Amino acid sequence: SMTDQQAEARAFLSEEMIAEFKAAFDMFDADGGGDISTKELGTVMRMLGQNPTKEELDAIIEEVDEDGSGTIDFEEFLVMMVRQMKEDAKGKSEEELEDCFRIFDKNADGFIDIEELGEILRATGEHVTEEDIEDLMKDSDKNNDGRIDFDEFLKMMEGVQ
Ligand SMILES: [Ca+2]
Ligand SMILES: [Ca+2]
């Protein structure tokens, strides 16, 4: 069901981006065979802005090099590329979210209180009323303590996963 994975890897990407990826890829494919040595996988990934740990690179080669060819074809390469891209993106957002919280928690007590919540909303310039701010608090405040912890904040920001 790799061919399934392969088809889903291509659908995630736009054709121009896929061709750009190939253009980089083809730089390490001499014989014009459509595959590179798994030795160059990390390199190509990195030039195209992915940052796989050595351990994840080792897992991938392991997955693709089941026959001992010592090579990975462009299709299994887009598959690995999308896995990496998703793994990386998610990661970025976790971090920005963390930053966000630290910024919103103006007294750094570990919670966003109704006063802090109001000030940040009101600063958007949006025409939100008190009733509106207190509605978002109740809805997000899961243990009914009147404040939002990091835990409720993630739930708040990311909705229903
Ligand atoms: Ca606070
Ligand atoms: Ca709470």
**In contact, 132 and 95? CB cutoff 8 Å:** no
Say whether 88-161 and 1-87 share the same fold. Answer: yes
Q: Is 72 helix (H, G, I), strand (E, B) or coil?
A: strand
Work out whether strand 147-148 and strand 112-113 pair parallel, antiparallel, or are unpaired: antiparallel
Domain range 1-87, its CATH number among 3.30.2320.50, 1.20.950.20, 1.10.238.10, 3.40.50.880: 1.10.238.10
- Which residue ranges make up each domain of the chain? 1-87, 88-161
Q: Solved by what technique?
A: X-ray
The second-level CATH assignment, the architecture, of 88-161 is Orthogonal Bundle (1.10)
Closest to 75 in 3D by CA, of 151, 125, 7: 7
Tell me the chain's radius of gyration from C-alpha atoms.
23
Resolution of the experimental model in angstroms, please? 2.0
Helix (H) or strand (E) holding 66: none
Q: Exposed/middle/buried for 148, CB within 10 Å: 0-12, 13-18, 19+?
A: buried
Q: Please give the biggest Cα pair distance in the chain.
A: 68
Q: Which residue has the tokens 């990496």?
A: 84
State how far the Cα of 97 lies from the Cα of 103, in Å rounded to an integer.
10
Q: Which residues are annotated as a binding site for Ca(2+)?
A: 29, 31, 35, 40, 65, 67, 69, 71, 76, 105, 107, 109, 116, 141, 143, 145, 147, 152
